[model samples]
Target: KVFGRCELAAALKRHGLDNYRGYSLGNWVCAAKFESNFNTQATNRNTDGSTDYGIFQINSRWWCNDGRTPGSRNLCNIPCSALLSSDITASVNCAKKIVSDGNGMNAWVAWRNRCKGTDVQAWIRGCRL
Candidate 1:
């Protein structure tokens, strides 16, 4: 079975193509692949015992102002639950904010290499898009 819904994939792809700004599609794909294996349901427990959830491994406790509540606001413009929920556009746009705030694709790549144990630079070099 697929990890995420088709709409989520398309939205993420669109974000990769458009809102990723100075990054290459290869970098975005590499980051996504490494971060969540493209799994929207992906989750992890941090060392501090906080939970990082969803496709981008965003920390729900940090991003979601009201904890697990659905309508909770995020530090970014969108709701935090939108990152975990089925609203792919919101998630991607939030990711764009992270990228745009000067973190850049290299940060994502480095995160992938550390968190997912994948060589993101090599993956980006070989990725077609």
Candidate 2:
């Protein structure tokens, strides 16, 4: 699924992403925009041989087990493939666990480099959340 900006805003809000861990929904929206362009099936392979999956681009190295990453603990206790689902429930839930583990939104480099300390409200403007 390729979500438009506001579409994703509403979706993430419904899943309790709004202001989670002190990071606004706009922050999440901005991360997804730059990470995967809101594409549910997005995947990227790192030079270290880890893969990022789904809307949040959860990495297989630490959060999920792709059965390929050398020492993956599957911290999220889910298969990496599950992150690619269009349902987004798994992705959203796993993302929360990532924060619960004290990473906050900094778990995603895209958020750190792009969304952090910016006027991310623009990402959710005009959205009827």
Candidate 3:
């Protein structure tokens, strides 16, 4: 899917402090494409009826509590349930922090390990700014 280049670019700029440190626009677009087809409003459900929420497919319930409520400072001020709410940068930055090890790549690699072969490689390729 197509993303607003300006909006996406700005979002990338806000979080992408270093070429080797953060996920690029291409990386984010690719991940969003693969994960939720760029649908910030997307959500998924397990057999038990619990759900994952947002464009990054954040399972806020599992990974955080702020995502269930407004004005909470979990990762991003916005909750996972409001993944598509006015704060798009909040969601993307939250995901970036998750992968960035609070500001490093080790966490990103760890998360990438869950994906095998080309999946991780593809993300890495896109991550290059």
lDDT of 2 by residue, 29-85 (tens): 999999999999999999999999999999998899999999877988999999998
Would you estimate the TM-scores of all the predictions?
Answer: 0.63, 0.96, 0.54
| Predicted candidate 1, C-alpha RMSD | 5.2
Query: Which number leads on TM-score?
Result: 2
The candidates, ranked best first by lDDT, are: 2, 1, 3
lDDT of 1 by residue, 84-125 (tens): 665556556666766666656544543645534444345435
- RMSD (Cα, Å) of candidate 3? 5.9
lDDT of 2 at 73: 79
Tens digit of lDDT per residue, candidate 3, span 6-108? 4444455565532435443444544555556656677776564445566566655444353233333355445555665545665666676566655443333
Instruction: Evaluate model 1: give its lDDT.
Output: 0.55
In candidate 2, what residue range of length 10 has the lowest lDDT sum? 99-108
Error of 2 at 76 (Å): 0.9
Error of 1 at 109 (Å): 6.4
In model 3, residue pairs whose N, Cα or C atoms come closer than 3 Å (at least 3 residues apart or on different chains), thus clashing, are: 67-80, 100-104
* lDDT of model 2 at position 39: 98
Q: Is candidate 1 or candidate 2 better by TM-score?
A: 2
